[PDB]
Structure formats: structure tokens, C-alpha cells
Amino acid sequence: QNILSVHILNQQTGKPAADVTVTLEKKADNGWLQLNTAKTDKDGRIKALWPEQTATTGDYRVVFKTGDYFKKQNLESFFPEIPVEFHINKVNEHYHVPLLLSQYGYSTYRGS
């Protein structure tokens, strides 16, 4: 299992959100360096979001480009995109960050 997985469930259809761009960024100085970008697969997943580069401890941000996702469906959303910031304090462990998504609401958490 990859250090970082993400997935998106669309709570309006009760199905995965497919083909959503998701970026990964590392905090550095007062900003953020992009480490990767990928798109959720047909099951709404990116099982392995970390690039082929050793992960270091630090703070990271995943950005779910959900605004574009909704825009392709002619749907408005309150959020142009959804950033989620989290600590990686242990590079030996698996980090899983699902997104439960609606147009005007969402939930995120550390999964298993």
C-alpha cells in the first residue's frame, strides 16, 4: 500500500467521483511545492498519490479539483476546489484521505 491514497464519493449520486484532478503539495517556507497531480480512476480512487520519490515528514495539502468536476456536469458548487491539509509525522505509515462530496458540503477524515 502507497503512503498516500485518496478517494471521492459523490453523495448526490452515491457513486464514486471519477476523473477528478487531485494535486499533492508539500509545505515549504511560507508556501507549497507541488509533488504530484493525478486523476481519480473509475472507482473514484487514486490508490497511490505519492510520486516515486521518498516521502519526508512535514505538512502536506491535497487539493481536490471538485469545482471543475461539477462544472463539467453543468452544476454549481460553493467550492472552486477543496484543499485538505494534514501532518505526515510518520513516513512508515499509510495515509488515507477520502472526500465525501456534495455541491455545497463535504466531509474529510483520516481513513484506514
Q: Binding residues for Zn ion, per CB under 5 A?
A: 5, 7, 59, 80, 87, 94, 96, 112
Site string for its own copies, 37-66 (x = CB under 8 A): ------xx--------------x-x-----
CB under 5 to 8 A by kind: which of Br ion, Zn ion, its own copies, none does 79 bind?
its own copies
The reply to whether 7 sits in an annotated binding site is yes
Measured between alpha carbons, how far is 25 from 42 in angstroms, rounded to an integer?
Answer: 23
Query: Strand 58-64 to strand 21-28: parallel, antiparallel, or no bridges (unpaired)?
Result: antiparallel
Rule CB under 5 A: say whether 5 interacts with Br ion: yes
Give yes or no for a contact between 81 and 75, defined as CB atoms under 8 angstroms apart. no
Q: Which three cell numbers stand for residue 111?
A: 481513513
